[PDB]
Amino acid sequence: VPMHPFVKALQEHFTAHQNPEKAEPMARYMKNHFLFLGIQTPERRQLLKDIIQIHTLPDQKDFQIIIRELWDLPEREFQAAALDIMQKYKKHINETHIPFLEELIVTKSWWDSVDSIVPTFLGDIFLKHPELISAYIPKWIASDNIWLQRAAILFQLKYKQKMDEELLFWIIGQLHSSKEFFIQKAIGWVLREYAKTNPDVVWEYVQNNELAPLSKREAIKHIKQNYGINN
DNA sequence: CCCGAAAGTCCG
DNA sequence: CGGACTTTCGGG
């Protein structure tokens, strides 16, 4: 069965505008885990828009199919475009898509794709369906997969006053001993971000609970100004 | 335009 | 370790 014509068109149009000179540093930035065509976001967005203008966005029945086919292509711009396309189908995504999103997280995994999936798509789903959090978050934490662990930390990133504090700190407690950079840094990020909403609770937490040095330092990057640095 | 964020390198 | 610096991206 041939590639979806929308995907084939996107592949042709991206490839015709590839930049091997840019592709080298772009690939190095992601520690050479991926091939790149060398197309940065402003142009990549326009090239996608070109193809939508010519062909129209595919019927929603093909949404998941399009994403998977782009995910399977070698160059990283196709996963970036896949996430752009998923946003265009946003109003069709619901709690039944959690396993689909899980599978995107653990395939072709790196911080660029995982950070674009978790606080937005999964964040929105669990905001509307908080009773489903316990069907997934314990498995993610227990898994061997650091990107599922990062997902458990960051899905509440944008919740602000809707943050479940007890849950957030429980998740962090489960992962605070991890030696993995992407876990330590995610803990620092979500604490730094939540401190914009409730600085007192984040300050108390980091002064009274064990965290990796990186995690603590990132968490209080800003709020240390409000409390001071004791001699 | 600005700022803050993922990262990233380089240095002591 | 952690500070200083860098580019790219998203959002005032």
Domain with A19 in it: 1-231
Virtual torsion, Cα A42, A48, A49, A55, nearest 10 deg: 170
- Which residues of chain A (55-114) touch nucleic strand C at CB < 7 A? none
CB of A17 lies under 7 Å from some atom of strand C: no
Q: DSSP class of residue A75?
A: B
CB atoms within 10 A of CB A108: 19
> Domain tally for chain A?
1
Torsion over CA: A22, A57, A109, A191 (sign): positive
Q: How far is CA A47 from CA A10, A42, A55, A59, A230, in A?
A: 8, 9, 12, 20, 53
CB of A40 lies under 7 Å from some atom of strand C: yes
The technique is X-ray
Tokens of A88: 């265009």
Q: How far is CA A29 from CA A21, A38, A76, A79, in A?
A: 14, 12, 12, 16
Which domain CATH number covers A47? 1.25.10.90
CB-based burial label for A145 (10 Å; 0-12, 13-18, 19+): middle
Resolution (A): 1.6
